[model samples]
Target: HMSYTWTGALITPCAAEESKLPINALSNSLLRHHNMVYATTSRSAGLRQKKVTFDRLQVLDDHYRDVLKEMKAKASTVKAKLLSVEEACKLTPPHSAKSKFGYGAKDVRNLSSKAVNHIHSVWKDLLEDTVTPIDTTIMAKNEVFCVQRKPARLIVFPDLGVRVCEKMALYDVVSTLPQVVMGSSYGFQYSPGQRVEFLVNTWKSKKNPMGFSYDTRCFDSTVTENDIRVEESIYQCCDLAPEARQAIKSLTERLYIGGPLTNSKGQNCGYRRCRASGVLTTSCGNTLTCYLKASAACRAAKLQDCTMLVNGDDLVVICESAGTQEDAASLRVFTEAMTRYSAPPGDPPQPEYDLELITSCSSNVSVAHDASGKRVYYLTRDPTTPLARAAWETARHTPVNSWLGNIIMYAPTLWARMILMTHFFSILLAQEQLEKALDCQIYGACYSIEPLDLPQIIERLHGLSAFSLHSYSPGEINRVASCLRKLGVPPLRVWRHRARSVRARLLSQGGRAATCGKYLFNWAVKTKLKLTPIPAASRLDLSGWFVAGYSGGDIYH
Candidate 1:
């Protein structure tokens, strides 16, 4: 039934009926989906039996070291700067976690004594305990797929204070090191546009390149304690004080490898038998091991010209194809190799002719039409979740979220540019501050973004083509239509008309609003607007407010 989590079902029902409502009736829900998480089984009482378990020790071998050797080489070329607690603390958004020790993120931003104390206290306690496994706030992340398929993806992530600690210790390592070590093979390095181009180019480069996406059922849970410890061994190989190493190792065993899963009301719901979904290391850990396993598997199967792109557990392989008759046999052998490696395919790997049609990371290539009636190929999702969340942002005060992300990632698309950008920019204009800095995230790290950098950020992340290109898949189109009805948001056609009116209004009272329309409206008279260089280098730096990582650390393969 595609149970993404080690749970009762893919979409387990929550017995909770408004038990964890906001403090005030008019107040918003606690940090998004706080009230929606269900820990105990309602009707299917047996589902409470769903539990987590894991092996404690990880076994490393020659192959693991081989991957680490390659990673170490890349790490050598990098000099990631270590961030101060103040600097890392500054990057924390206002919506970040409140402390039981008597302060919230706003106080932290204001550098309140209480906030500072709590931050120090949290870190101090981390060092003090050094052996306790951290408890994470778990939730049923209610999400929509294909614009209609609503599912609750269980999310397990660290608490706010621990998150800061993670950045202090591993953020730089996670964000930059893997990119260098894995090179083009690293998925985080590529935007959607860049990723698609890489795939297409690699496919074309091969005479008969076979492309396939390997799905691992419950991938996070499958990561044994050995896998985690082995990963930590690689991390510990970095230079650090004995205290730092102990803290990192303690964090690994306590929170990362497996941690206590607490529900919203703060009940000890259970413990994770495997990797938790909501930690700094989840993505990087999954990607590193997936590539290693797939690389070894590919070689064992002797799949020609094998190359892979991995995002956590989602994997795509493109390489020289064997003939049709042999391709099927080769696939079976490949599957067998992977199965023995502790990663079996969710669906048997199927070789395909069109790389674009194969879905990975919940995205696939699709076609849509531009203004001239010419076809366009751009990366697009079902627009279901994006539209649904846009409707949320429209009615509520969401901090930093998917609506802005849709506009940024889908910047060039007709739907995002016309609908999402139009709706949000209009809201900001109504608020009389079009250029206000807003918080958003990339690859799990937070950032401070503004409207002025839209053109530049769009140009840098997805490239300029994102704005001009147009087209969507039939599946994506159908999902968009359905999401509109479900969310009570306007259809793309309705938004098209709505955008013109918004654009005209924004342009009428010139300023950033005028420039927004100039840049935001696809058909408007373009202007070379005063733009910011997206902080410094790349969007992850909170528009350059954030800095680089490590002057020195342990370097081990």
Candidate 2:
């Protein structure tokens, strides 16, 4: 049979007051049972064999262990108190302010303005230094093959003079010339040494007589004799140059003149005449000479002063001028072509053309013609007029009312606030679960169990009496049952039968079996017996009962 041994103060008498306590009442009864069994069978088969030596135990040395347990209990109390305080804080009401002002509006505005100013300063510096001039040498080279004319449509010849003086006379004639003498309709051309004179007369109109008379004389006596030779040679050189000859021929073919004159009332006069009464032959001769002189002067100025040299430095200046002229000419041609193409084909309606022709020329002139074939010119005396200036500007500024508006609109709403809170709480819970699982795996591995599913296994084991059941052989089970019985636990039955009958037995009698002379016999019977081995029993049963006394009686109990 199995055996066990236990040692303790099993049955100390409970005080009257202690007995009234719930735990003490139950423990006292259990102690009485344990004491009765321990006294009666202290040397019994199970108790004697399972006796444990108490040589290693010292209750007096366990003071630190008891102190550690008390400390753990105190720490739990402190933790509970802290939790209560935190809960109270969570339930407290939030405060609302009575003031109308927000918390940090001024601070925010100041910070934003500072950032904007810094960015603006950076961009301003960059833009001021970053303007790049484009190279137009290719355009200047192309201009060498084209003729140039002044009041020159740059569309016809993009290459023009870089400085204004190259295309115009150097003398300023504002002090001498009459305002009405020079007008838009009457074009003029001049060389360095030249004298120009014109006589104005009053014309008798059909309705009014002797309207106006003006006389003008312009003398360029400052022009030296060398200037005259230079002017003559410029024309001569232009005529001989193959490129200049080609340009002139091309320009001549494209040129056309003759348009209706407008009167003061802005009505077209198909036929107009000069105020001078002259013979047809004399008038024709004067017209031919004027035309020839104007054409020659134009050719000379372009060839001498306007054309660019082949050197790189001069070419750059020429190219810039050519590019500007090319742009102007393109604008003019596009505008004129659009107007003409848009107009319906017929006797061509007389539309008042508001041509604000802004050129390098320094004067504004007006001309009018009347129905009675009279012409008049009005030249404004203002020497300086406002001119358009071109420049590029760069600025930096922040975009407003984009994503900030959405943030503001959603922030104050209760639903949005709740959603944010929920998300935060969910993230916290997920992190907590992850930490707990990792801790469980670490601790479980230290205790020699599979770490991953230990929590589930622990839950399953709840409420069951468990032993660290190592070495589950029949002998070990018998030893464990003995240990439990010694501690006053009811021993299980499976261990009882296997412990007593697991090995062989022997029976013998001494020689003599005579009693009252009915039969006289002096014989001895000796028998060798082997007990049948039970399937689950162990060799430990054959080693003899481990109990101190009452051999195997406790196996049944």
Candidate 3:
């Protein structure tokens, strides 16, 4: 079946959309080439629709069923509960799209009688109607990027009431089942630090580690009806309530299997027979489907002792190498198996001898040195996108400021410390909004993080070594430098000078602001204060921070 069928209707925007970066005084301070930055708007949706619309083919064999059976067995052990209306309502983001029925996100969060009543009605409808195709809004996502000129990503989501019902039905199931079924292979279960440790340990465990990342072209589009049904079967394996079972079955048929796509202007755009990008099950379903296919592919290729790390559609496999020549040949067989299974790679897989060179989740493990000259491993990525987005956010107020998220996730990396921290803190200090809370998404969940708490957050997530790390790997440093040059971002030396001024102003504040300056910008000074463990670090409850990916799942935590 084709992923989508269009109605000759265009995906229209409700209001005017900005396709270029809005420049302000702070923009040139971070990036000089303002024209290089652009935002994707509805105008490019036609291109995306063409790329994503495709026919899917699958040839499931014994290996596929074997892996499915194993996953189901693990899933059977989980007991999942349906969330209460109030419970699910609290999970909705305050700024989420309002329902067409008159209630808005604020009303839902406040647990207004109208919102709760409509939610209950939606849940009841789910149990009663098991075969009706639900309606979803398809909109082009306005995301910023450097001059790569990629089309806008599309988001497909049902109405507000149905979304809450989705949470009521599958919140507990999605949260608890994935870890049990996939075990350590589930990449979202680890923080950046834990992720690096897992990669290092897994790589070292192999005698001759052959690792490669499998990239599925438009992974959501490649999802077939069989795959969706298979995911529903896995959900059914869980110990669930009677109503929950009915709700899951109804949701599977109505929302998960396929739905009609409505544009923001209330016009029919198309019909989707593949994965809906925005739903409670998107992350979990994708992870399960990707893992199942890759696991089966490993067996088909006769690969030995494979350790798979999957985050949604992002996959990295570390296995004992059969010889360089044979490993290369085996990867060809693996790709062939995956292609036959309907999860063909965007870039064909290859055996990578070095672990650090194999990128997954848009990041790679790189090395740096702690204060005691001990080798420290940390996660880093090309800074071009981060710098570009930071430049955009500097000029305009965005719902989620990605600079904060980048600093949190890549705290130990040299580029993040020197550039991201320096640039954002300066702007925040200038606006005197250092105490203000900003939202950022991590592992697909939205978090309203305060800038003042970064010291403790970094300490807990990456340890104090993040504050004092130096001597970054040559490859990592060169990548950052090259990206800075490409994006017209100022070199590290200019950022260092700016950091000293930002640091002085912060230190004079003598509170959490001072602590941020002391810890986050200590590298800019010749003499550094001895870093200590943050008192607030131990009090932080970050248990669910890295539990799952919820990119378009309408999740807030």
Cα-lDDT of candidate 1: 0.62
TM values, all candidates: 0.77, 0.12, 0.99
Worst window of 10 by summed lDDT in candidate 3? 548-557
| Candidates 1 and 3 compared by lDDT, better number | 3
- Give the alpha carbon lDDT tens digit for every residue of 143-208 in model 2: 000111111000001111100111111101111111112121122221100001111111111112
| Alpha-carbon shift of residue 61 in model 2 (angstroms) | 99
Q: Rank the candidates by TM-score, best first.
A: 3, 1, 2
Ranking of candidates on lDDT, top first: 3, 1, 2
Give the clashing pairs for model 2: 3-46, 3-482, 4-46, 4-482, 45-547
Query: lDDT score, residue 104, model 2?
Result: 24
Q: What is the C-alpha local distance difference test score of candidate 3?
A: 0.92
lDDT of 1 at 99: 57
TM-score of 2: 0.12
**Residue by residue across 1-557, what tens digits does model 3's lDDT show?**
89999997888886778988888877788888888999999999999999999999899999999999999999999999989999999889888989999999999999999999999899989989999999999999989999869999999999999999999999999988999999999998899999999999999999888999999999999999999999999999999999999999999999999989999878999899999999989999999999999999999999999999999999999999989999999999999999999998898887888878989999999898999999988888888888888988987888888899999999988888888999888888888999998999998788999999999999988888998899988898899888898888899999999999999999999989999989999999999999888888899988889887887888887
